[PDB]
Amino acid sequence: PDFMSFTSHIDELYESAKKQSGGKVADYIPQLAKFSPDLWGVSVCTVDGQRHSTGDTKVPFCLQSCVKPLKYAIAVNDLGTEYVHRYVGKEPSGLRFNKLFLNEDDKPHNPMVNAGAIVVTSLIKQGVNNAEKFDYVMQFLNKMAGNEYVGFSNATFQSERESGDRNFAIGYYLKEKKCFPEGTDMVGILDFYFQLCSIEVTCESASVMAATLANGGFCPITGERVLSPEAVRNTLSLMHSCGMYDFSGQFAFHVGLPAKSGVAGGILLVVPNVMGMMCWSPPLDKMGNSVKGIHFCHDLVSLCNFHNYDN
Amino acid sequence: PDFMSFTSHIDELYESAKKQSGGKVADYIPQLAKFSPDLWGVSVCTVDGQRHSTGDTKVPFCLQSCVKPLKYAIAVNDLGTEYVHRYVGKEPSGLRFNKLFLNEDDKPHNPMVNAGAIVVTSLIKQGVNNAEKFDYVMQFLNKMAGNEYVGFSNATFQSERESGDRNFAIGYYLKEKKCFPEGTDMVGILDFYFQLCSIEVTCESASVMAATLANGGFCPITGERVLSPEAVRNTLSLMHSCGMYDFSGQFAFHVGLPAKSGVAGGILLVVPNVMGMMCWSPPLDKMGNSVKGIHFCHDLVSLCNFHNYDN
Amino acid sequence: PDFMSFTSHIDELYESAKKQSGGKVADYIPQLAKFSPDLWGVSVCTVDGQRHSTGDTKVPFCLQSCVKPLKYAIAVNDLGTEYVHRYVGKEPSGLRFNKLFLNEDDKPHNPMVNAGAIVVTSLIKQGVNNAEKFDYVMQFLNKMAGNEYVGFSNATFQSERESGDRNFAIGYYLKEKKCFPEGTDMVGILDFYFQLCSIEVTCESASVMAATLANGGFCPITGERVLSPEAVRNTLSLMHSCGMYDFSGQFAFHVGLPAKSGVAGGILLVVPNVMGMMCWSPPLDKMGNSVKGIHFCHDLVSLCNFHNYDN
Amino acid sequence: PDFMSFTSHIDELYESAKKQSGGKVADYIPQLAKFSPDLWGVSVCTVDGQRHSTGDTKVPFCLQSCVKPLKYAIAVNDLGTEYVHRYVGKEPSGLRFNKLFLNEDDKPHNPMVNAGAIVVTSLIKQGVNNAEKFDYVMQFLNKMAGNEYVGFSNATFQSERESGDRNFAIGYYLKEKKCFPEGTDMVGILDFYFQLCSIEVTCESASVMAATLANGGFCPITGERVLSPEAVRNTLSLMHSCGMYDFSGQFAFHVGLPAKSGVAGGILLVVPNVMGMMCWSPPLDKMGNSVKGIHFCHDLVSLCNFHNYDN
Numbered sequence A, B, C, D: 001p002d003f004m005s006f007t008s009h010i011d012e013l014y015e016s017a018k019k020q021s022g023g024k025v026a027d028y029i030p031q032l033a034k035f036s037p038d039l040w041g042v043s044v045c046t047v048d049g050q051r052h053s054t055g056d057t058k059v060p061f062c063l064q065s066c067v068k069p070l071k072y073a074i075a076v077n078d079l080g081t082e083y084v085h086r087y088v089g090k091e092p093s094g095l096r097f098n099k100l101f102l103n104e105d106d107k108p109h110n111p112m113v114n115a116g117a118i119v120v121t122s123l124i125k126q127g128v129n130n131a132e133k134f135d136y137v138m139q140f141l142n143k144m145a146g147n148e149y150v151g152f153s154n155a156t157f158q159s160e161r162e163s164g165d166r167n168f169a170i171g172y173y174l175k176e177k178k179c180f181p182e183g184t185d186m187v188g189i190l191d192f193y194f195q196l197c198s199i200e201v202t203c204e205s206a207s208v209m210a211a212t213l214a215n216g217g218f219c220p221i222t223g224e225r226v227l228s229p230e231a232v233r234n235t236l237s238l239m240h241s242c243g244m245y246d247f248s249g250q251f252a253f254h255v256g257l258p259a260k261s262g263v264a265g266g267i268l269l270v271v272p273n274v275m276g277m278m279c280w281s282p283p284l285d286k287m288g289n290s291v292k293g294i295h296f297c298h299d300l301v302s303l304c305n306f307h308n309y310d311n
């Protein structure tokens, strides 16, 4: 409504979350361990195109799991809900089944878990080599960001692949259970998966991608239709219930917004018909979510009444 | 917007769902088995007070599990979110842990499962006898329905109590795990629980209760504040993710509205800032939800674009 | 072989286990908490009738779970293997399913877990009242002990019943799943169960009961046939794999003898065609087994080569 | 005792089991599918060296899972109980955890499951290449069989490796959880594993290997010490509780002998201080055990009273 006054509250919330110094920076690969715990950035892009940034918003970092809802949207956009959900489920697994790769029907629980993102990766642009598949997804992310920063980290790619024994275990398990479409080169799909995890954004460019999802699939800084209404609706439902790892249920109850976190410390946040946001702070909590970002999200809903069922 | 034209679409959807004759009427007690499979009613109450009914909308039936979100709302209204959630969790259990009474922290998964509703019943109006507790809840349901039909089935009460061995197993298990507030007479709480399950409504009176939840806790036919905004928001989040038994996840994805089903064939449905509805048809599917009601809900969201993340 | 020299090794092992002061005396009821941690007794009865005792062997204590294999033997003796195993399974549950009352077929895992012992109690001497059922089992235990000390603790009975909420949860759960024979008064079976748990023995009398199982069902101090060969064989197989709570698998691997522990600190031990033993020391470890008794059993197999697969 | 008369009962039991035509020959690789359902052989080797064969006892088939207890014995023989069980557990998993690769302590449940056999394979003769490791195990199996038929199927090896996606998923999962000794080439260990599964025996040569285990680790046809008493005792305990897949618990209760089945239809059976046996019939039941072999084992214990706890 009054954008100038709203940005002052964003700056206040940014400053309050800055004092929250807890957490541990992810250190399983040296490309994540490198990062300073003090980096903290918040970028907002409204559905009308209004922008606002505070902090470290032009420093590139990997999307990691923040790419999961984006490639799911691309798959539904090109293939439809029915085809995509023959290979992947549509609900959270719960704390009891959080270590199992598949559900009762031999399908990955949802697109937001590793097994589900690996199957979704196998459905995109079938029939062409990995170079063409990667270019096709980059072309799509550039439209979602309004041609803003979309890069690639080769160091992260080489490190994820050399140390991803758990993902290779998922790959061979999905192959044994017939989870992939026929004629899938599983090892090549894992390569394409590690490449998508290694795509780099800034808070500024990623907030535009979140504002595309908040604006019914239309990029707000170009006015271009990028995703179908069906792809956007399905991505937002699954971000609301499955996007914050084992904290998804607490986040749906207290925050009630579609969001997705990554191991780099990013939280892609969507406020439907209002704005898109990207919070980034490398230190993660026990659940794997950014400590500063989680604090910021709780304060944002309390102050601005953005929760789905807020009156 | 144009109420007259909207009711014609409700009548069309009612007629389309009427042809769906599948399902089985619940028969574990004779009071549920009695019911005709052909009974089918739909009542709408908007947040402005506009009413519309089609079918068997003045035939009383028991709320059964449809009372779970209502007593949860009363508990949060009187005690607050923090106190209530020391005893009960706030998320779905999943298909893996659908037979366990408690979660990792020795708490019932959420207020929408039997163990959770039993603990919530133990928190309401503590310190008084069951007659006063029952009157207090009836007084609250009468305000939610705008003084419309709220009755009681003694036959259902006596039958639920004489055959509820599973609920008695939950009661003793919660007592062993220290799930109740100190000085709780567990057997007396089970009695109060069977009584609340036996409360009778019509489609007409129950649609007013659903419209109270759709209107920020204000009854639309009286203008009286019945529930606090905090109680309404929490009830709607848990109805969205836990309200349709093992179908909750499919319903959140395809329908995306807060709803709650019961073994009598009722589906209490909320469309925030628009209306409240009660669908009722005794035959249930394998998941325990009304066959006609589930069909009606899917058609309603497709036609009127009421899904949470619909643009 | 040379009994005099063998008793000197028993006295040495007794003295070595005496130095092992770890553990905690069970304190859930005051009748168990009363007990001194320093009480330690070992009694041996060979299949030929040779006796030897060291320590506190004439102090009465409750059998508790040590009665589970004894009532199972009585059930198989009177009804046969086929009838008994229509109601109860015949294998360990494992660490994953150690909190579930039933297995995949809606049956208790084995007679050595609480749910299984409750179902076995429901099969003994059906058609008569609890006073006659109790007398019938006492008559049987007196034959197993060669008319040596078999008493009853009323204080333990009243305390087990007043605080056994977990057993009442099992009782109502088994009733819901149709686990009992038709026309079973479940509450009366729980009463009979608490009574059997409260039967008192000494190390001396209990070693005779273990020597009856070691001697093919013939009491070694009377020569009387008490149990059928089929009842003895089935009891010994289930004591070998299910008798030491969550330590059953480690005990089968390192000790390899049929044994059964109880919360009073007793370990009923059988060495087939050699002898029966009862070790008793109130302090229990994290698994619920007597610390001194477990130490003694490990030393006994190492020294005398009694393990099933020892050459 | 009277060998001539005993062989007549073996011939009678062979003839009775021959009429049991149920089951399905394993068909996941063409090398198993090839096999006739009518092949049925029984070979006996006593601890004194007495031999007897009936049926198809000189037709070679792969050991498959029948090699699991043999390589476990070799590992304990060379490294001891303590070192081996730092990497692998010592008990059955149960029906609830029959699809999980690891137990509560991030270790494979026991050496008789695929994950456990893969870890055991990683412990044998470390520091040398796969050709030397394979020769070392062949040298050991030749001593166990008294220099009787021990071959190799290259076709089975190439087929197991090309289609073993589940074993590759186990391999990468064990690598992620740090289950192998440091500096393990996991892919090379999987190769060595597929090679050991492809070793070929006849009923005659395999009954000598089972008689080595029945004779305290001394080969009965040569008198040579092959395995240590500790290796034999540990192998027999784990064959008794974990050797017949999901039927292990029913087999321990009804048969009570150490045994191990394989997908080729073989059942390696040990009667301690009496004899070793190998039953072979390609058609398997739902549990994966040979239909004729299971029938034969039940008849053998009933007739000759060989059950561990038989008087």
Ligand SMILES: CO[C@H](C(=O)Nc1nnc(N[C@@H]2CCN(c3cccnn3)C2)s1)c1ccccc1
Pocket (backbone or CB within 6 Å): B099, B100, B101, B102, B103, B173, C097, C099, C100, C101, C102, C103, C104, C105, C106, C173, D095, D096
């Ligand atoms: C399907 O048949 C059984 C099955 O469901 N048996 C059950 N036995 N007891 C049950 N419920 C208890 C009541 C309280 N329960 C807990 C425990 C811990 C925490 N909260 N609650 C346990 S369910 C099964 C399926 C699959 C795998 C193994 C077993």
Ligand SMILES: CO[C@H](C(=O)Nc1nnc(N[C@@H]2CCN(c3cccnn3)C2)s1)c1ccccc1
Pocket (backbone or CB within 6 Å): A099, A100, A101, A102, A103, A173, C095, C096, D097, D099, D100, D101, D102, D103, D104, D105, D106, D173
């Ligand atoms: C906590 O330590 C273990 C534990 O988690 N062990 C695991 N072993 N293997 C695992 N993952 C496999 C990969 C594919 N898996 C399936 C199976 C079936 C369906 N989908 N996926 C199985 S997890 C444990 C905890 C609690 C109780 C028992 C065991």
